[PDB]
């Protein structure tokens, strides 16, 4: 009816633990409740919904909520975190007997167990090089994270994680570029806060 | 199958008048228009019961809508705007709450096509000290230069799309941040064994597929018409 919430718009769980994703309603009489998932570049995909028959609801892939009527929320659930479960996740509701009113929604990150991190910062020459690089900083675990350039000529990106499925193996990497003469890989991410221990060859 | 939008992927100007139309083929009476913007989900902007019967969702205004038929629900910008800018979705509903929503419409709103300009794109290859420190490989994209932010990019291996091992920015930077009309910048990574990039055999591809103008649009610049196009660039694996 009148409402639903979720809030984070960006949230984290470590690869591995629970995950548990909230959200409230508000409306007088129990509603309709429904959680949608989707993938970058697809469309919406129901996961479960309650609809007044079992209050514990189960879904596709070990997902589950309980309705709490007293507590007016239907909080998402699912074992243990896979790198799959990265998407971004809609609470949604029925109202006014006619549609349904769809949350914020909230995108969901998992951490990558990293027991053994390699921080480095390598450079990578243009495969039709004429004379072009980039900085690519890899192997980080997930205490750290990437900030925003101070140079307006360095370009910056967030930090990225990749699942290599070869080998089971997944790791943390972000990527900073300048056409400056002045540019070098061993000062690119000088405003972040990077691992004592981080790897620069020579 | 049930339900159908067209077009896909939209590129239009400030001004003109455009046409999304959704179409089923289970003969529900309800069928609504969403649209989705980053933080704020889908907010509906207009629903119908029936031909004769329309109501105004959350955000209605700038939009109209027709209901020509018990299959079809058309939704009409009648004057673009850029901050219509969105990915619509429309749906279906039975009597119990089954939706059913369709594919997409990616539509992006500029102001003047004149600054539309698609990718350079540039592999760079693995680093050598990555390569003998960790014995994996990781080869870099970066598309550059283009505008409007609408694109899409895949990485090729020996002519297959991959996905394992890949990580793409999940929005462009822009190149001029103080510009309303910057151009876009967007990097990937993809991640292979050193043994695999070492195989001069291999052949891999970064793939930009770039929505711009279509054949229809005037252009009057000398550089190239900034037309819908893939741009690509590669490497082939090397043992030294």
């Known amino acids: 009816a009148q409402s639903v919430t979720q809030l984070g718009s960006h949230v984290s769980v470590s690869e591995g633990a629970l995950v548990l994703l909230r959200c409230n309603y508000s409306?007088?009489?129990?509603?309709?409740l429904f959680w949608y998932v989707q993938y970058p570049n697809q469309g919406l995909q129901l996961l479960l919904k309650?609809?007044?028959?079992?209050?514990l609801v189960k879904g596709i892939n070990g997902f589950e909520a309980e309705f709490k009527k007293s507590e007016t929320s239907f909080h998402l659930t699912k074992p243990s975190a896979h790198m799959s479960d990265a998407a971004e996740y809609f609470c949604?509701?029925?109202?006014?007997?006619?549609?349904?009113?769809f949350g914020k929604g909230t995108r969901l990150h998992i951490l990558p167990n990293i027991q053994n991190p390699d921080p480095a910062v390598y450079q990578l020459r243009d495969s039709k090089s004429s004379d072009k690089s980039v900085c690519l900083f890899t192997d980080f675990d997930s205490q750290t994270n990437v900030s925003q350039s101070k140079d307006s000529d360095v370009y910056i990106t967030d930090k990225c994680v990749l699942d290599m499925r070869s080998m089971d193996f997944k790791s943390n990497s972000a990527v900073a570029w300048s056409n400056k003469s002045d540019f070098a890989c061993a000062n690119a991410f000088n405003n972040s806060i990077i691992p004592e221990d981080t790897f620069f060859p020579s | 199958a049930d339900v159908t939008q067209t077009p896909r992927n939209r590129i239009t100007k400030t001004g003109k008048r455009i046409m999304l139309e959704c179409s089923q083929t289970?003969?529900?009476?309800?069928m609504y228009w969403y649209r989705q913007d980053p933080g704020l989900g889908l907010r509906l902007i207009y629903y119908?019961?029936?031909?004769?019967?329309?109501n105004k969702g959350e955000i209605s205004d700038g939009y109209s809508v027709s209901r020509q038929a018990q299959a079809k629900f058309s939704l009409s910008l009648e004057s673009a705007i850029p901050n219509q800018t969105a990915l619509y979705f429309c749906?279906?509903?039975?009597?119990?709450?089954?939706?059913?929503f369709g594919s997409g419409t990616r539509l992006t709103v500029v102001e003047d096509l004149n600054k539309v300009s698609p990718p350079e794109v540039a592999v760079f290859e693995p680093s050598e000290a990555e390569i003998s420190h960790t014995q994996k490989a990781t080869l870099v994209c970066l598309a550059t230069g283009f505008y409007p932010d609408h694109v899409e990019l895949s990485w090729w291996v020996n002519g297959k799309e991959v996905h394992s091992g890949v990580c793409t920015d999940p929005q462009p930077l822009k190149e001029q941040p103080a510009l309303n009309d910057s151009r876009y910048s967007l990097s990937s990574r993809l991640r292979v064994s050193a043994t695999f990039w070492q195989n001069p055999r291999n052949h891999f591809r970064c793939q930009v597929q770039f929505y711009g103008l279509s054949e229809n649009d005037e252009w009057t610049q000398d550089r190239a018409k900034p037309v819908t196009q893939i741009v690509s660039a590669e490497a082939w694996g090397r043992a030294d």
């Open positions: 409306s007088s009489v129990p509603p309709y």
């Open positions: 749906a279906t509903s039975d009597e119990s709450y089954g939706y059913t």
């Open positions: 949604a509701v029925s109202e006014q007997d006619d549609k349904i009113i």
């Open positions: 289970k003969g529900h009476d309800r």
């Open positions: 309650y609809t007044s028959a079992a209050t």
């Open positions: 119908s019961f029936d031909v004769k019967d329309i």
